[PDB]
Symmetry: D2
Amino acid sequence: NRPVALITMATGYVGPALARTMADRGFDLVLHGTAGDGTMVGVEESFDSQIADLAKRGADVLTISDVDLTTRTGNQSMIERVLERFGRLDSACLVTGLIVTGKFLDMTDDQWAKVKATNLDMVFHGLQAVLPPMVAAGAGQCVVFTSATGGRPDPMVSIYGGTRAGANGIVRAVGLEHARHGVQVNAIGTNYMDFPGFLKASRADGDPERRAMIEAQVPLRRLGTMDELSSVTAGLLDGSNRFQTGQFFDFSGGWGA
Amino acid sequence: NRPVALITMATGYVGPALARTMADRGFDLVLHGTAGDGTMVGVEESFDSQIADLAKRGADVLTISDVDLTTRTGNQSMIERVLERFGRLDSACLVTGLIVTGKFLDMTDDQWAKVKATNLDMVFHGLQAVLPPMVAAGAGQCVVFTSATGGRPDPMVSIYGGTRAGANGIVRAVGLEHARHGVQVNAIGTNYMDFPGFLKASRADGDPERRAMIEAQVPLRRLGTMDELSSVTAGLLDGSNRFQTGQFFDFSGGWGA
Amino acid sequence: ENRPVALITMATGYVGPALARTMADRGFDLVLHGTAGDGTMVGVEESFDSQIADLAKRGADVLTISDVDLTTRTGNQSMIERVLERFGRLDSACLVTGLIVTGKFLDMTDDQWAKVKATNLDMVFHGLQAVLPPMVAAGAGQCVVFTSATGGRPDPMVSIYGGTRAGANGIVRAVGLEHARHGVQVNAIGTNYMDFPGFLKASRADGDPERRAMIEAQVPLRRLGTMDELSSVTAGLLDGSNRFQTGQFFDFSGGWGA
Amino acid sequence: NRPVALITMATGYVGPALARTMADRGFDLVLHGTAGDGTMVGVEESFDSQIADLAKRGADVLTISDVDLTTRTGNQSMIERVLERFGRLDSACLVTGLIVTGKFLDMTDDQWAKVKATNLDMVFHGLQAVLPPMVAAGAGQCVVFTSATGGRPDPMVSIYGGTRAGANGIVRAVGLEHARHGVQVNAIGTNYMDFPGFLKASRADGDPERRAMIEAQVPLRRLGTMDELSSVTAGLLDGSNRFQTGQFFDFSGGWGA
């Protein structure tokens, strides 16, 4: 009678570490992500890599990789397949958004359309899909991964940070609107996290000089690890804490304080 | 040589009062709004009624009413017409957004698409249009009218309040990004304002008992007047204050404090 | 006839003089608290005597007060008593508060800690407890408490100053909301990078063009604010033209606190 | 070689539960609190009761109960005694403050002096005492318990909530100032917590009708438990999360969102 946790984009970012710890805490898992092996873009830990490890930890796993999470149908389909496999949805970790930077006046209509689709549509359709079963069950926990930029939308990240702030605002209203049904919805916004995506984007991957310069921008003078983040995230998804909802948590080494 | 102020949606909301005070302060005006007489929806003060008054106050007026301010072309065309008429743009008051309320899970794809177009596209394309001439001049003042809900996105107004928070976030980044060019961009978010639109929506227009209950929700126990709001708004657009940018100002009788 | 009355503290420096002029232009009589002396005395940027003549030309009666300790109940209560005695009314109050202290948190002494509480908090608590009763009784009033932009972003090297400024803003929020129903507004303005002798001397930018440029470089709008700008915003919250904001904090630092 | 965690006011509030979990996580403990049995005011779990339980969990315990934590001497002496017994200080949970409510204009000079001493002096002297050894060690984690009222200082809680906001502000600056030394300092502000103190103050301790009205004020329609709070608190003190500092975390069932 294990509870069920959904994790999207689970082939990279916090998904793998979160899956391991959520399995340690007695959860069955539905992992949405990108199909293929490590060579494929955006695959930091392949599905096949994880299935064996999570099985050892006692978790059943369902993988999903043929849905468009910027759309209603994609998210509705994803949840339909969760309920089909395990008849229940207790926790949901919705990873959203795609980075875009540059001068505000250089932003194209395509960049504007893309950032709305990744930073907002994923949140709107994601929440409209995970909530109904949680409300029906009278209990549920959701974490929406936005960005620490949402807490301080800065120059050169206008449309990305701004829409992240809108995502946090949606999460606040939704987290408060369904609190009375026993459902929690909170947002985590990270920055300066140590995973291949950020290292490649920041050009720190193979450059120690660049790495030191990036870390110097962080008050704690380091990059965050996925084990740390997964521990905090799991804390909001494992049922141990049921007294926070509609809130935004900065996780950027103090950068967003 | 008089400075020039742009005001959108100027046939209702704060536009008319703002136009009068901005003219008193020595500005020529470009008024975007709805073409018609009082009978047309969204026309609280027609162009023709205002032009006579603003002329007495010494202001030349250019009217615009055939542009789609949710698009790049509409906003770019509007500013092109401002510049051909008056060769300069000193101040811009961009009124944006359209109210939508209801349970989060009842929101349709159309409502979601509409709120993004009114609360976000208007801001993105509006700012991309007004800023270039201000940057070129090394001076400019912009106020983006969002909503007090952006400061506290609450249940029953999730996607509206949330996107308003995103609009405020964009304003913050943009206001900071172009500060070094001598350009200010700030946001004002109102609520419980005394104008026919809100009165009709709140159903208090002809019900004194209804109004007293609405006023009871406001700490200052009253509704704001457009003359008050126009005075505050003009303070951010008349050149008297050049030391605030990237900021959001709540104007809701303390409701958003 | 029947001019409204505005109280301004610390009016011999900072925003007081400019605020007094504009408030007089807007038809207010004035009570100016400040430091007694001429320009040579510390903390006197515009002496009472300098202002008395100008404000009279603008049509304002002036009462000066300079023998009260505004960190205490007695000082603030006495100040308001003397306002009501001279003009029977108090319509607006601009309470300038606080005294700068900086340095490493672990270097702060008990005296610095005691001083920052007295200037940044006691002035606000006793100031508001004194100005509010007459406003509540009249059913109308407007108050601005000058705190600091550091209250919006308490940073390293400004821990106890910025932190207590944040507490002052918090008190202003609760009080501004608590007495809103009586028709009284209480808001806070927090400034930084203002162009007045105090800041120029403190920042060491006085007579140092390179230093001045460096300080301005820290401001998004790449400049220092002027008292005429600040007094215009401040008066807007004290002249009765805007009666729909209370319990709020307004950053005034060229975007530094955005 | 166990790490050392200091917990103040450990005879009530979160202290006992936090001590248990921190012991489970391999910490030695120093508990400051009130000396006595349950009959004494403010004693919910006596020292003697806890020591036996904590000993079973593998923790050495040092008790301290004759210091005035509103003063420099009290806090410095407390930390000296911590270092004397265990030569190290890794984590510190500084519980601070004392509730006071009423109309702002009814507050006396004694109430004003008391709230400054409990809500601010405890924080200033507390941090000045715990930080030096953590800086010297190049690592440390501190949680300062303030109040959810600090996030929204409301009428009838002016001086309490306001000073709580100042405490959070100090924590932000201090948490950012010593981040480069590997030290974290964060604040947690609670409300609507289920413990005898709050139940007695709210008069709900024996009135289910009163309690049901209390829970109705909370978005999640419940009171928080110390086990939940201790789990979140321990998460910021057990070394598992070293990427948050200078931050304030609301823990009030969404009341402070």
